[PDB]
Amino acid sequence: AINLIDLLHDGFYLIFLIRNQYVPADPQRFREKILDLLNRFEQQAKKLQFSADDIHDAKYAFCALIDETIVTQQDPSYFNLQNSWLISPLQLSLFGSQLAGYQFFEILEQLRSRGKERLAALEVFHYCLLLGFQGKYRIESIESLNHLVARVGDEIDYLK
């Protein structure tokens, strides 16, 4: 009954704080807190017997989401947290990737297709979309992204 969204409950709250304009007092202590929460999340998700791909893709989505929340911030208070983060964004540090804007949506299309068998992973990718992740849709039309969020949400409602 515990979900992958619930294991990331501590990590998503810190996403919510940055969205809510809270600024970490210590950027590098903030970053090691994220890394330890992702290992906690993995150790706990592995013991609850979630598949290695579900664990991998939930952490991937959260890292794509935390990276873009931080880098898109325009208010000048975030200037020191952005300057320490851009040294190594977690997409690049943990996955060697800079293609998350596109590949988050490739992985999402794989999970929509797998439906019930990967629905724990797909609930995470939907929740990253409700907490502001845009990726590749930021420069394309944005209404296209709301309709995508709406129907992935519908499919999750349907799969229950």
mmCIF file of C-alpha atoms in Angstrom:
data_model
loop_
_atom_site.group_PDB
_atom_site.id
_atom_site.type_symbol
_atom_site.label_atom_id
_atom_site.label_comp_id
_atom_site.label_asym_id
_atom_site.label_seq_id
_atom_site.Cartn_x
_atom_site.Cartn_y
_atom_site.Cartn_z
ATOM 1 C CA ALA A 1 0.000 0.000 0.000
ATOM 2 C CA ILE A 2 3.063 2.212 0.283
ATOM 3 C CA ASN A 3 3.725 3.923 -3.054
ATOM 4 C CA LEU A 4 6.839 5.298 -4.755
ATOM 5 C CA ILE A 5 5.318 8.770 -4.339
ATOM 6 C CA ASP A 6 5.206 8.104 -0.567
ATOM 7 C CA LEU A 7 8.878 7.022 -0.403
ATOM 8 C CA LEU A 8 9.822 10.281 -2.185
ATOM 9 C CA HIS A 9 7.592 12.232 0.233
ATOM 10 C CA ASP A 10 10.626 13.783 1.961
ATOM 11 C CA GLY A 11 12.313 14.707 -1.339
ATOM 12 C CA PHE A 12 9.204 16.201 -2.973
ATOM 13 C CA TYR A 13 8.700 18.507 0.042
ATOM 14 C CA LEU A 14 12.037 20.195 -0.703
ATOM 15 C CA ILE A 15 10.916 20.590 -4.334
ATOM 16 C CA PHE A 16 7.793 22.272 -2.983
ATOM 17 C CA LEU A 17 9.845 24.664 -0.801
ATOM 18 C CA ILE A 18 11.918 25.942 -3.727
ATOM 19 C CA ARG A 19 8.753 26.352 -5.763
ATOM 20 C CA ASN A 20 7.446 28.289 -2.754
ATOM 21 C CA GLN A 21 10.476 30.605 -2.884
ATOM 22 C CA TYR A 22 12.310 29.134 0.117
ATOM 23 C CA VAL A 23 16.059 29.485 -0.422
ATOM 24 C CA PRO A 24 18.484 26.962 1.130
ATOM 25 C CA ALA A 25 20.849 28.628 3.588
ATOM 26 C CA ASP A 26 23.670 26.220 2.629
ATOM 27 C CA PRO A 27 23.496 25.163 -1.056
ATOM 28 C CA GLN A 28 26.042 22.300 -0.738
ATOM 29 C CA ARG A 29 24.516 20.933 2.449
ATOM 30 C CA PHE A 30 21.205 21.059 0.574
ATOM 31 C CA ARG A 31 22.698 18.986 -2.257
ATOM 32 C CA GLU A 32 24.054 16.236 0.016
ATOM 33 C CA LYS A 33 20.640 16.103 1.691
ATOM 34 C CA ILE A 34 19.081 15.300 -1.721
ATOM 35 C CA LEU A 35 21.715 12.634 -2.440
ATOM 36 C CA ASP A 36 21.128 10.956 0.915
ATOM 37 C CA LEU A 37 17.361 11.079 0.401
ATOM 38 C CA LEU A 38 17.746 9.343 -2.956
ATOM 39 C CA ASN A 39 19.834 6.553 -1.402
ATOM 40 C CA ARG A 40 17.330 6.253 1.477
ATOM 41 C CA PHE A 41 14.604 6.083 -1.171
ATOM 42 C CA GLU A 42 16.475 3.400 -3.062
ATOM 43 C CA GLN A 43 17.362 1.202 -0.060
ATOM 44 C CA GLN A 44 13.709 1.448 1.050
ATOM 45 C CA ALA A 45 12.225 0.851 -2.406
ATOM 46 C CA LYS A 46 14.566 -2.115 -2.964
ATOM 47 C CA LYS A 47 13.469 -3.721 0.344
ATOM 48 C CA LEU A 48 9.847 -3.243 -0.531
ATOM 49 C CA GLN A 49 10.681 -5.200 -3.675
ATOM 50 C CA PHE A 50 9.998 -2.595 -6.365
ATOM 51 C CA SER A 51 11.699 -3.488 -9.633
ATOM 52 C CA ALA A 52 15.101 -1.979 -10.419
ATOM 53 C CA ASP A 53 13.624 -0.057 -13.357
ATOM 54 C CA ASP A 54 10.903 1.537 -11.189
ATOM 55 C CA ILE A 55 13.536 2.670 -8.663
ATOM 56 C CA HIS A 56 15.829 3.892 -11.458
ATOM 57 C CA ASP A 57 13.082 5.832 -13.248
ATOM 58 C CA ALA A 58 11.562 7.401 -10.121
ATOM 59 C CA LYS A 59 14.960 8.717 -9.078
ATOM 60 C CA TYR A 60 15.616 9.854 -12.679
ATOM 61 C CA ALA A 61 12.372 11.861 -12.794
ATOM 62 C CA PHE A 62 13.038 13.441 -9.407
ATOM 63 C CA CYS A 63 16.541 14.502 -10.473
ATOM 64 C CA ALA A 64 15.283 15.941 -13.763
ATOM 65 C CA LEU A 65 12.631 17.824 -11.732
ATOM 66 C CA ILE A 66 14.864 19.209 -8.951
ATOM 67 C CA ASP A 67 17.416 20.332 -11.544
ATOM 68 C CA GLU A 68 14.938 22.398 -13.573
ATOM 69 C CA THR A 69 13.136 23.840 -10.558
ATOM 70 C CA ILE A 70 16.467 25.276 -9.389
ATOM 71 C CA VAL A 71 17.854 26.416 -12.747
ATOM 72 C CA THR A 72 14.611 28.181 -13.897
ATOM 73 C CA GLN A 73 14.467 30.391 -10.802
ATOM 74 C CA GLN A 74 14.714 34.052 -11.752
ATOM 75 C CA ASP A 75 14.649 35.834 -8.541
ATOM 76 C CA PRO A 76 18.140 37.045 -7.448
ATOM 77 C CA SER A 77 18.084 35.381 -4.021
ATOM 78 C CA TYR A 78 18.603 32.035 -5.804
ATOM 79 C CA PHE A 79 21.823 33.256 -7.440
ATOM 80 C CA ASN A 80 24.219 31.460 -5.050
ATOM 81 C CA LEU A 81 22.233 28.214 -5.013
ATOM 82 C CA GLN A 82 22.156 28.188 -8.813
ATOM 83 C CA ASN A 83 25.885 28.966 -9.036
ATOM 84 C CA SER A 84 26.809 26.038 -6.803
ATOM 85 C CA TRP A 85 24.313 23.685 -8.467
ATOM 86 C CA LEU A 86 25.389 24.343 -12.083
ATOM 87 C CA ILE A 87 28.854 22.960 -11.237
ATOM 88 C CA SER A 88 27.249 19.500 -11.448
ATOM 89 C CA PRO A 89 23.505 19.120 -11.930
ATOM 90 C CA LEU A 90 22.221 15.805 -10.624
ATOM 91 C CA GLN A 91 21.102 14.694 -14.080
ATOM 92 C CA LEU A 92 24.718 14.983 -15.190
ATOM 93 C CA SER A 93 26.265 13.734 -11.951
ATOM 94 C CA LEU A 94 24.037 10.676 -11.460
ATOM 95 C CA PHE A 95 23.074 9.800 -15.040
ATOM 96 C CA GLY A 96 25.727 11.525 -17.162
ATOM 97 C CA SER A 97 22.796 13.044 -19.044
ATOM 98 C CA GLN A 98 21.694 16.455 -20.266
ATOM 99 C CA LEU A 99 18.762 15.117 -22.326
ATOM 100 C CA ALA A 100 16.199 14.961 -19.510
ATOM 101 C CA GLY A 101 13.984 17.586 -21.175
ATOM 102 C CA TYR A 102 13.344 15.048 -23.953
ATOM 103 C CA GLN A 103 14.050 11.693 -22.340
ATOM 104 C CA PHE A 104 11.702 12.222 -19.379
ATOM 105 C CA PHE A 105 8.941 12.116 -22.025
ATOM 106 C CA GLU A 106 10.324 9.036 -23.829
ATOM 107 C CA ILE A 107 10.301 7.157 -20.495
ATOM 108 C CA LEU A 108 6.831 8.512 -19.794
ATOM 109 C CA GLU A 109 5.521 7.077 -23.082
ATOM 110 C CA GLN A 110 7.019 3.684 -22.191
ATOM 111 C CA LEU A 111 5.191 3.715 -18.816
ATOM 112 C CA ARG A 112 1.855 4.835 -20.225
ATOM 113 C CA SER A 113 2.179 1.843 -22.569
ATOM 114 C CA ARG A 114 2.955 -0.573 -19.729
ATOM 115 C CA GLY A 115 -0.080 0.703 -17.791
ATOM 116 C CA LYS A 116 -0.736 -1.375 -14.683
ATOM 117 C CA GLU A 117 2.622 -3.168 -14.529
ATOM 118 C CA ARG A 118 4.606 0.076 -14.142
ATOM 119 C CA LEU A 119 1.901 2.278 -12.591
ATOM 120 C CA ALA A 120 3.994 2.989 -9.493
ATOM 121 C CA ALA A 121 6.654 4.564 -11.708
ATOM 122 C CA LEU A 122 4.041 6.381 -13.786
ATOM 123 C CA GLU A 123 2.448 7.997 -10.714
ATOM 124 C CA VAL A 124 5.869 9.578 -9.996
ATOM 125 C CA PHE A 125 6.279 10.930 -13.542
ATOM 126 C CA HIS A 126 2.772 12.449 -13.380
ATOM 127 C CA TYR A 127 3.500 14.020 -9.979
ATOM 128 C CA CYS A 128 6.705 15.607 -11.274
ATOM 129 C CA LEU A 129 4.545 17.108 -14.027
ATOM 130 C CA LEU A 130 2.060 18.558 -11.466
ATOM 131 C CA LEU A 131 4.986 20.052 -9.486
ATOM 132 C CA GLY A 132 6.057 22.152 -12.473
ATOM 133 C CA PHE A 133 8.359 20.041 -14.610
ATOM 134 C CA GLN A 134 8.138 21.167 -18.247
ATOM 135 C CA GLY A 135 11.294 19.900 -19.925
ATOM 136 C CA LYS A 136 11.093 20.129 -23.675
ATOM 137 C CA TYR A 137 7.590 21.677 -23.553
ATOM 138 C CA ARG A 138 8.977 24.929 -22.095
ATOM 139 C CA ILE A 139 9.951 26.270 -25.556
ATOM 140 C CA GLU A 140 7.229 24.478 -27.516
ATOM 141 C CA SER A 141 3.579 25.377 -26.975
ATOM 142 C CA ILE A 142 2.749 25.043 -23.287
ATOM 143 C CA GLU A 143 -0.947 24.193 -23.651
ATOM 144 C CA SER A 144 0.269 20.952 -25.206
ATOM 145 C CA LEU A 145 1.845 20.163 -21.842
ATOM 146 C CA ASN A 146 -1.280 20.787 -19.773
ATOM 147 C CA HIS A 147 -3.273 18.451 -21.980
ATOM 148 C CA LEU A 148 -0.555 15.812 -21.601
ATOM 149 C CA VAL A 149 -0.630 16.187 -17.814
ATOM 150 C CA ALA A 150 -4.419 15.985 -17.873
ATOM 151 C CA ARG A 151 -4.595 12.643 -19.704
ATOM 152 C CA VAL A 152 -1.732 10.886 -18.001
ATOM 153 C CA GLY A 153 -3.747 11.813 -14.936
ATOM 154 C CA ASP A 154 -6.838 10.306 -16.564
ATOM 155 C CA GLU A 155 -5.009 7.062 -17.410
ATOM 156 C CA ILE A 156 -3.870 6.694 -13.816
ATOM 157 C CA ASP A 157 -7.473 7.229 -12.677
ATOM 158 C CA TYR A 158 -8.510 4.640 -15.293
ATOM 159 C CA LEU A 159 -5.941 2.026 -14.250
ATOM 160 C CA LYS A 160 -7.490 1.934 -10.744
#
